[PDB]
Amino acid sequence: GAQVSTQKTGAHETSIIHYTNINYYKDAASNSANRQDFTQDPGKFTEPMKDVMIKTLPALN
Amino acid sequence: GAQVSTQKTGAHETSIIHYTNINYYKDAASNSANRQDFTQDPGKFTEPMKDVMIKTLPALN
Amino acid sequence: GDVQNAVEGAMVRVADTVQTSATNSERVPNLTAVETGHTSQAVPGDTMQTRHVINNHVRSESTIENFLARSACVFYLEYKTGTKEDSNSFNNWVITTRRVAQLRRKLEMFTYLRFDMEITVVITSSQDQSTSQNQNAPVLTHQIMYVPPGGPIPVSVDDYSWQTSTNPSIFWTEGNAPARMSIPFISIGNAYSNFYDGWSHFSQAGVYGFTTLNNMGQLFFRHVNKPNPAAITSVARIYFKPKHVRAWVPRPPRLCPYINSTNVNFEPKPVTEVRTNIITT
Amino acid sequence: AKVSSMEAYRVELSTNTNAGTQVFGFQLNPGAESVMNRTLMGEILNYYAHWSGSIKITFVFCGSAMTTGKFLLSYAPPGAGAPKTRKDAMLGTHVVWDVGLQSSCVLCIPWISQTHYRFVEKDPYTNAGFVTCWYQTSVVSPASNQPKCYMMCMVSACNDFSVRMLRDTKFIEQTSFYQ
Amino acid sequence: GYSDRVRSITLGNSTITTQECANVVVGYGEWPEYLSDNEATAEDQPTQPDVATCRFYTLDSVQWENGSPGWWWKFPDALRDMGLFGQNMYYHYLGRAGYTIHVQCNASKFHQGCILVVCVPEAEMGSAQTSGVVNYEHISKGEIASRFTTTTTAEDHGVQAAVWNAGMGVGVGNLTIFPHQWINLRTNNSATIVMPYVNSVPMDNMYRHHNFTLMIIPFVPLDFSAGASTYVPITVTVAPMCAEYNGLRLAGHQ
Amino acid sequence: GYSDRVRSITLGNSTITTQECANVVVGYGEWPEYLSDNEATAEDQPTQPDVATCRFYTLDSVQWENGSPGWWWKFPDALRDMGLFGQNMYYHYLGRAGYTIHVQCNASKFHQGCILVVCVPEAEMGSAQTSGVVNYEHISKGEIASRFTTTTTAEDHGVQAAVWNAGMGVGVGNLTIFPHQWINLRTNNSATIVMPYVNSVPMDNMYRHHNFTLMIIPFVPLDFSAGASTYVPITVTVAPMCAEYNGLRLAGHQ
């Protein structure tokens, strides 16, 4: 029941290394920190607009 | 997700032994030393020549 | 190849001796011109008649990794068991390669260096002499804290800084195995620079040399234990191992003795050792 | 006095101000220079030791609707020193903002650096140059209009921005525990 | 046809000829080229002046004498006054370029002597007064040759230029690890080293950083006999290659 | 979307905005472009500095006053000190370029006044003293506005700048035949003229020849009333386009 995942390596000069995970305990709280999710959505803070603001257009018209 | 590789043994009288690797951590920095890459290219230091110098020929002509 | 993927090598043996016969010809493998900037790629078979030898020798230990990846001491630091009042109750080190002579000469054989690092630290304690040296002192825990360039310095053995809400720290009890960490390639530039023939200021001034580039932050050390009646002194030895190494631009090794950990200064030494006569046995 | 007040946020502009006049100037050390230092971007920066990316300073005119003006918004990269004159500023990366119905103009500051990353802390090697503002023409107004008015400046990080080497901030401390 | 002793190099409105060369050294095997979109960091468009910048600049030539210990020049700084290269370097925070270095020295079948011609990357020099620090005016006279010393001492914040330690605490006989040639007066009248941009970062400031130093050191002293032409100079001409500049503002120093 | 009153022009590390423009005049219908292989004569490779030269240079702005007669600037000479354009113009015998001229002038609904903004090719001006000859210092102050005179007389070898004859023996009301716009304070706050290289020969010397003159002449005087902002400047910012240079040598004047 082992999980294989990808290690944080770095941009190589013009790669994929893996690591292994086995969860030892019966409680998900006991698991490692969720450090590899680089997901984001600034939209809700940077643009909470009802009417979509198109950059090349004037903001007011 | 285990990796099998070759151990440094030695020239035998006229062989292949293996070792196992499992990366335990989420960061490639945490990995063992890259000790088995015996690659080389003295050319850049021993011969930085624009015109290729052929050994059996005179250096200057 | 991927210097971080350790278990992935390349076996490259040394060159074999090919058998040479006698010759009488116009080709001259050992007559050349040093002026060119080229090194002669001659093999003994161009000058002698050689036999056939199979060289199964490999250039193993001379790999940059096998050469640099042996854990060396870079510095040691000292601190006593004490109160806020005692300045000596804690200590710090600004991180630098140039403090010791041995690893510094090894790294400096290359201009530019890119690697990950394994830091091991041997913290050792001793009883101070005192009327109270008789004392039941319990097991001492230690704190090593990394403060990256910009964070709060600890002013005392006992201030908010030691909380480490964001700085990396290691807590280590005595008697256990030496504390060990791995460090990524921490630099802002594409490779670490052992040398910088340049200035800290655009106007050709301020700080000259490598110092300007190598801003690594610092390690703060303290005891976590409250003081026992008699003082106990601890000294921490910081060990560095360059692993996952890449190296650029080879240099001549340091001939002259090192003087300053700050700069590349030297006083002129002889090129080699002197001998009895130009004809020696 | 003005830093513990709302004045801190409003830059004072005036009518009949002569053409090449400088509005303000400072070197771009986000997270280190008092002007940007404790803003949202500045505060985030202060939990890190390395930054990277482009910054955008959005200039908003809060003068009378009946008022007018043109300004040179400049960014000089390092090495030469701070732009002493509107001509010096002109030579560097710049926007000439004409104020009008669109209230605000944004000066987009490009990441121009030797290195992929700079320090958050002020460092001579990781110097980022100077952002300055100048009257390109002047602020002009009609008859019963106020002579002095104000502009204001917003700042944020563009989609190429990032931060590294996590650290504790100098911005908060204690002597003892709280109760 | 084509004797390999003869060479013609043309770059911009410049041609150098030589009829006694000993091949040409391409630094570390790499020919100079422009900064690529993968390796870039400064987001602004680079200015690439091509022929206006990338051409042959002859720097102030020095005289070789029997007892003269040696010379060094620092790049790009030696070129800080050379035409439009200098101007571009003056108006831009960042600059990048490789270089064709051509050292010239002619004498006669009857003269003798041999000089090392070498391009040392990051040649960070030591202060003569080990206690103190060095300073720019004793590190570089721009296009004018800074001399190596036979004497083990110098004026306040002067570099320790004692030749056998190459101004940097090492054996001068090992300088050969860097891209180099030799002008041995028997063999050749010129040296040519094509140096790539060697540095730890894609672009850098043209003033602050001396990316490499050109050292010309006489290993075998200049000699000749009874009335056979005393004056024999060494002239260094250098051409920037693939030069590009980022971050433009006013005239720059501070 | 898109009100035609709003415009954004970007060239090099330069953007000018305007929220009250009146279209943009492309000189004689032609957008600037580089000298082609058919029309060329100087055989050497041109240097084309692109973004380093071709960017927005703001020249010394002048004040518009009720009785102020007018102003002129001469190109390329006005740019002889503007950054790397100036340097390239200084180190090359021949130069060629077109230009985006952007005149700026803002005031208020309550102000009134109207200026002609015009690019006159070969505006060869007459000597005030008809008997004598004119001279450079009375023809051009580089980036500083040379003023037109209401007065019919001037100091030794000064141009006859009497406004109604435009400094060149013609009716100023006919200047409109040349590429022009008007900043009428009611209507707009800026003018933009994109001038092509107009000349009888493919390239020319950047100093000797003033290829065209920018004249800003107030046809309706600046006016406003009782305490409504006195100071109202006129700022000219200009960007070189498709600039290329031939014939490189030393720093040039004589």
Ligand SMILES: CCCCCCCCCCCCCCCC(=O)O
């Ligand atoms: C308890 C956490 C400790 C974290 C320690 C971080 C240490 C950073 C080490 C930087 C090593 C830099 C090597 C520079 C080499 C050189 O250029 O000479």
Ligand SMILES: *C(=O)CCCCCCCCCCCCC
């Ligand atoms: C899936 O889990 C089976 C894969 C092989 C498991 C090897 C297990 C390693 C040793 C046991 C860990 C048990 C933790 C309770």
Ligand SMILES: *C(=O)CCCCCCCCCCCCC
């Ligand atoms: C691939 O990784 C699965 C192969 C079998 C794995 C045995 C794992 C050994 C015990 C767990 C090591 C876990 C380290 C986090």
